[PDB]
Every structure is written in C-alpha cells, then in structure tokens.
Design a protein around this ligand. Structure first.
Ligand SMILES: NC(=O)c1ccc[n+]([C@@H]2O[C@H](COP(=O)([O-])OP(=O)(O)OC[C@H]3O[C@@H](n4cnc5c(N)ncnc54)[C@H](O)[C@@H]3O)[C@@H](O)[C@H]2O)c1
Ligand SMILES: NC(=O)c1ccc[n+]([C@@H]2O[C@H](COP(=O)([O-])OP(=O)(O)OC[C@H]3O[C@@H](n4cnc5c(N)ncnc54)[C@H](O)[C@@H]3O)[C@@H](O)[C@H]2O)c1
Ligand SMILES: O=CNCc1ccccc1
Ligand SMILES: O=CNCc1ccccc1
Ligand SMILES: [Zn+2]
Ligand SMILES: [Zn+2]
Ligand SMILES: [Zn+2]
Ligand SMILES: [Zn+2]
Lengths: 374, 374
C-alpha cells in the first residue's frame, strides 16, 4: 500500500542550470487536503522544460521539471472530489480554481493560482512535497511530471476518458492544446484567411493544425530547419519557407507573398527576433499577431507604436486560451472520437531513464515530441 | 462664378515647423476627375494638426493643415456622383475607396489610399492643388481644411444630413468619431466592465462617452490637468485621478483600484510613457489596451513580451475603427436624432483668422475643442 505514506521513487532532478538531468531516488510526501498524488505513465518533452535548463526561464532550483503528461491517481487528500484513485488524469501547468476573477471571466484562463509569473516552485499552499538526498526539491509549474510520482493541486488535475492511451494524450496536457488553441481560441482564425506560423515544434505544428481546422485558405510555415517541412505540409501548411534561404528580412518576404501581410501570424519559438518578424508580417490594417513562444528572461522588444495604430492587434496567451480543467477533457474526448490525431507529432519514444537523450533529440532538431514512458 | 476656375482665397499656411501659421492668399486649382472642391464652414483644432507644428508628426512642408471639418460643396470633378454642389459634407482624414483589401475587410478601416504612413502631402493622384506666392503647397491627410476652399478626393468626402449644424458636427469628422469608436468598435467595451482613459482632450473625452455608451460600470479618467475632471465626470467618468498626486507609478495605482487592472485601457495623448502605463494598467489575464494617441516620430517603446503572453490584447486604430465614408454620416444622423450632444466638447469658438489664438488655447490646456468659423 502507498496511500498515506511517503513514496520513495525515481525522478529527474535538475540541480544546476546548464547541466544534464540526474535520475535520483526521491521522497514524495502524501497529498495534503485538496491535493492529488499521481503515478506518471507518460510525459512529453516540451521546450518550456528546456528553457529552465538553458537559463531562459527562471524558476527556483533544485527542481523537478516536467508538465506535459498523463498518469493514474494513486491517492487523494482530504476534501478531493473531482478525481479518485485509479482515474486517468492529465496535470495542468495553469490551474483552473474556478473562483478567481480570471476563472469567472469567460474569455480568460490565466488563473490566479498559477506559478508562472514570479515562480515559487511550490504547490498552492506554498510548500514542497519532494525531498532528495536530504534536500527539499522545488516543483515546476505546479506539476513536476519528470517523476514516477508527483503531487498536484486538485484544481490543476483533469480527469479524462478511462480508455485514453496515455502515451498519446499526454500531448494534450500542453503542446497540442496550446498550439491548436492559439489558432482557434486566441487568434480566432477565420475561414478563408491567410496565416503564418513561426516555429514547427510540437506546439507550432499544433498551431498549423488549428489554422487548418479553422478553415484558413493559406498557412505559411516558417522554420530554419527544413526537415520539419514535410510534417508541416502533412498537417495543413500550404507553403513552407526557410528564412535562411533569403537575402531580405522574412517579414518583407511574407508580406510580398500575401498582398501586404497575413491576417494572422503566430510566433511559436520564443525569440525576440521572430516575435518582431511575426508582428511585422501581419497586415498593418487588419492583421492579428499572437505570441505563443516563451521569451528569454526579462528581455524586451523595441516597437514603434505606429505598428499598432494602423489597425494591428497584438496578443498573447498561455495554454491556447483554454480554461484548463474544463478544456483538456473535451480535447481528449475529441481525440478518442478521432477528430484529430497526434501520431505525426510523436516522433520518438524512450524510457524515462533516457530523459537526457530525449533532450539531446530536442536540441538536434530531429524530434518534434519525444514521449517518455515510466 | 468659380466652377472650373482657379480660386484665390485665404488659407493658413505652415512654412516651417515651430512657427505660427501664416494667413495668406493662396490659389486652389479646380477639382480633377473624382475630386471635390469644398467651401469650408467650420474646422476643429485637433492635436494631430499641432503635432506637425511641433515636429512630432512628419509631413512635407510647406503645408495647409486641418482635417476635422465641415463645409459645402462648391464644385465637383468629372465622374463624381456621391456629392453635388450645395451638399453639406465632412472631409475624411482616412479615405474609404471601397475597393482595396482593407476596405473590403469588414474589420478594418485603414484604406490603402491613405496619406498617413509615409505622407506625400498630395491628393491620391500624387499631385497638389494649392499654390501660394508662386510655389506649390502640400496637402495634409488628403484634406487640408485650414483654408476657405479645399479640394479632396471623392472617397474622402462624406455627404451628410442637409440640416446639420456645421459648427458642431465638424467634430464628428475626427475627434468624436475616433474617441467614441475607439471604445465601441476597437476595444469593444462590454457592459459592466472597468475602463481607464488616459488623456481628456476632445478625443479622450469622446472615448469616455464611448465607454459610457457601451455600458462600462467604471470609467477612470486620467489626466495631469485636473481642470478637465468636471467635463470627464459630466460625460461618464466614475473616478478622476491625476498621476501627479501619487508617489506610486500610475499603472500600480490603477491596478490597486481595480482588482488587478482594468478590462479596457485607452491611451489618448500620444506619449510613450502613457502608452506603457496604459498597457500595464489593464489586467494581465483579461485586459485589452487600445492606442489612440499619435506617438512622436521614430520613437519606440520597450516591452517585455510576457506582458502579452499572460493574456493581454494590445491594439491600435485610426478613426475609432469606423469605415470613414459610411460611418461619418451615420454618426451625424445619430447626432441629429439627439442620441448624443457635442456641446460639452466645444469650449471655444473663433473666426478662422484667429487660428493662432486657437492653437494658443490648445497649448494652454484651457480648451477641449476650439472650432474656427469661416
Ligand atoms: N504559451 C504557452 O502556453 C506555451 C505552451 C507551451 C510551450 N510554449 C513555448 O512555445 C515555444 C515552442 O515550444 P516547442 O516545444 O514547440 O519548441 P521546439 O523547440 O520543439 O520548436 C521550435 C521550432 O522553432 C524553430 N526555430 C528555432 N529558432 C528559429 C529561428 N530563429 N527562426 C525560425 N525557426 C526557428 C525550431 O527549428 C523548431 O522547429 C517554446 O518557447 C515554448 O516555451 C508556450
Ligand atoms: N488614432 C486617431 O485616429 C487619432 C485621431 C485623432 C487624434 N489622435 C491623437 O489623439 C491624441 C489626443 O488628441 P486630442 O486632440 O484629444 O489632444 P489634447 O491635447 O486636446 O488632449 C490631450 C490630453 O492629455 C493630457 N495629457 C498630456 N500629457 C499627459 C501626461 N503626460 N499624462 C497624463 N495626461 C496628459 C492633456 O492634459 C490633455 O487633456 C493626440 O496624440 C492626437 O494626435 C489620433
Ligand atoms: O509549456 C508550458 N508553459 C508555458 C509557460 C511557462 C511559464 C510561463 C508562461 C508560459
Ligand atoms: O487626427 C487625425 N489623424 C490621426 C493620425 C494622423 C496621422 C497618422 C496616424 C493618425
Ligand atoms: Zn509545455
Ligand atoms: Zn482561478
Ligand atoms: Zn480602400
Ligand atoms: Zn484629428
């Protein structure tokens, strides 16, 4: 039995930035009131996890990263009502408390119980459930899924279809929902419109899928890695261009291919240069540009306000605008009915013990999503 | 008779930046095909005109400024069908050609025939109709209304109700439509929402009227000139605050007054610091901020993309989003139907010859709109 007891298990701990993950024996405390302890089944490698390693995203260390995942409930704390032991669940990097101003506003989803702004690396009660070699270890985005077992706040755990293939649906926990929703919920891509998507990783390709689902007439995929172009076309891109092939700035190339600019542009990389290009490539009078990529810590863009005064709309969002707890299960339901497939996004599968090799794949540009199995 | 002949009349010519206007004798060529020559009746003094004088807005000199106006058609060029001699009309700083991509797009209004982006200071055919002291004089925003007679492209002239009091409705030509529409069309202020309006000039107060018309629960007026507070309250402001009264940055003050930030913020001044404050004061998860003010030439803002990634929408627009030729007459019809009044905005009236005194009033902060009569 494990309920009510400290669990000893393996986890990938990041002790220092710019270093490999270390697979360690860790101790996981039992869940407190309104908490859920989950046995991880599958976790996807998202660029957001990598940003902590590279120093581009600040969060307290030492830490157990991981947020795109799926697992089975091992035990629940007192007061939990939305999930029970044995349920298949997907943890959520942005919670849905259902009580704050944001949760009550139908158009927003950045719940006030999030740990994204000035990260504490704890659960919502301000404390940590992990210890390793006599040291407390921080949580990440309230989820910490690079561990055989994690404890998450109930409002950051979504119950899903019991027949779900967890090794696939874990992508719905972050990458697919974010990319797809960025097109459908945030930009609100219109039928017959033109779109440009910067970045063809798991998130960007999911945005290409969203643009196609929304009925876009043209979807121009932009990436410096041409090996991603086949998958982009498979998922809906009508044209694929590599900025490295051109002598002039990519935003000028894009405007010239689109009668002055696209109706909707998306930055799904996390760089200041591409965020600028993305904003500049949407038409000055009717374009909308959505920021999806996470930018490097405390770095700023320099923009002339005239870029907006002419009629542009510049916006950003987390999770593709989806209210997390209500949205993820519906997306899983859609997946089960075959409304969309995730196979094209999952290029590599590896045991959790080979997590470092999974990050090597990400860095090499050979993988879209590598899914780790426990 | 003047039809078909060059007209000799008075106009206010700006020969150099930072210098008073020179009331001079000028010559106005007859209208070409698809052009309209208008006898001016009333013109409002908008800060945009002043920006050219101060060097904050660049346009070719020498030039006849003026764009917020109303007059009577004196003659029309071949092919003109939408107006005829004797019609009351309002010239439009942004045209509505009805044929370009932007005009066909229901969501936009920055017609491709505009002279706003990189101004040429001419009519749409690339030439000028004004001469003074043997030299050509440039047009401004295609309208040049600081003249007893001006020639404007047909797609930049709106026919209005024949019973319109021109000394009042000229404001619908720019300031009122821009401010009001910025709230109703651009931000799409919702009933029961909270708003913050930076700047209480003719445009800003019109934005306050728009927020009220849209049903906002709270409308916080922000201005360093407390003498504008009475009119802001009269027109709908629920609270009026002066940044100079605080030790804390204004965006922080605003967020603390509104549970983390307003739903809608408007910058209606034209300064980088207030554009930044306005963006920062809207709620990070559900706020929308609209830039209305024209910023100083070639100057940039420094923004951290995280400000948008959490869920904000940052946008800008000209003319409050109204398609100019179709929209202006509807606003005049609403005015004639007594849906709204413009009296509160018109604080001073002066004959055209005293245009410099009108600009002195603007600079002093004693006037909202000064209307000049011909
Ligand atoms: N807003 C959110 O809620 C949210 C959610 C998940 C991920 N993210 C962010 O989304 C971004 C994408 O994540 P991912 O997992 O898909 O990343 P990824 O690294 O797998 O994909 C990035 C893609 O961008 C391309 N690219 C990199 N530099 C480029 C450049 N200079 N020009 C053109 N293309 C370039 C890469 O070749 C790769 O195909 C990351 O910044 C991640 O942190 C945000
Ligand atoms: N987007 C458009 O289509 C459009 C149309 C018309 C005007 N404009 C621009 O709108 C802006 C407003 O025009 P207006 O004619 O109403 O101007 P105005 O000068 O009459 O009003 C500006 C107001 O801002 C206040 N103010 C100035 N500096 C401030 C500061 N630092 N902090 C707080 N308040 C400050 C002033 O006291 C004044 O009440 C101008 O930049 C104008 O060029 C834009
Ligand atoms: O990938 C998951 N989350 C993206 C994200 C992380 C931290 C802050 C904002 C957004
Ligand atoms: O006030 C009238 N027009 C505002 C404006 C002028 C020039 C460029 C953008 C906006
Ligand atoms: Zn992620
Ligand atoms: Zn909440
Ligand atoms: Zn047009
Ligand atoms: Zn104006």
């Amino acid at each position: 039995s494990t309920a009510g007891k400290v669990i000893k298990c393996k986890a990938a701990v990041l002790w220092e930035v710019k270093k490999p993950f270390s697979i360690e024996d860790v101790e996981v405390a039992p869940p407190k009131a309104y908490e859920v302890r989950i046995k991880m089944v599958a976790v996807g490698i998202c660029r957001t996890d990598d940003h902590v390693v590279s120093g581009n995203l600040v969060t307290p260390l030492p830490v157990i990263l991981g947020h795109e995942a799926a697992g089975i409930v091992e035990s629940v704390g007192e007061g939990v009502t939305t999930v029970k032991p044995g349920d298949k669940v997907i943890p959520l990097f942005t919670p849905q408390c259902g009580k704050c101003r944001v949760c009550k506003n139908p158009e927003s989803n950045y719940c006030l119980k999030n740990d994204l702004g000035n990260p504490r690396g704890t659960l919502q009660d301000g404390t940590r459930r992990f210890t390793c070699r006599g040291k407390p270890i921080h949580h990440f985005l309230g989820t910490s899924t690079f561990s055989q077992y994690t404890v998450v706040d109930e409002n950051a755990v979504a119950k899903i279809d019991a027949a779900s293939p967890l090794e696939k649906v874990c992508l719905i926990g972050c990458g697919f929902s974010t990319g797809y929703g960025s097109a459908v919920n945030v930009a609100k891509v219109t039928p017959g419109s033109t779109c440009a998507v910067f970045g063809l990783g798991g998130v960007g390709l999911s945005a290409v899928m969203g643009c196609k689902a929304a009925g876009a007439a043209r979807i121009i995929a932009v990436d410096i890695n041409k090996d991603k172009f086949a998958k982009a076309k498979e998922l809906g891109a009508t044209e694929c261009i590599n900025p490295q092939d051109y002598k002039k700035p990519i935003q000028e190339v894009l405007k010239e291919m689109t009668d002055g600019g696209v109706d909707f542009s998306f930055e799904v990389i996390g760089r200041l240069d591409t965020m600028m290009a993305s904003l500049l490539c949407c038409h000055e009078a009717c374009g909308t540009s959505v920021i999806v990529g996470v930018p490097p810590a405390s770095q700023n863009l320099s923009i002339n306000p005239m870029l907006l005064l002419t009629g542009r709309t510049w916006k950003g969002a987390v999770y593709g605008g989806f209210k997390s707890k209500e949205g993820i299960p519906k997306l899983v339901a859609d997946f089960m009915a075959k409304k969309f497939s995730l196979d094209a996004l999952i290029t590599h599968v590896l045991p959790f013990e080979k997590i470092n090799e999974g990050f090597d794949l990400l860095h090499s540009g050979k993988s879209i999503r590598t899914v780790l199995t426990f």
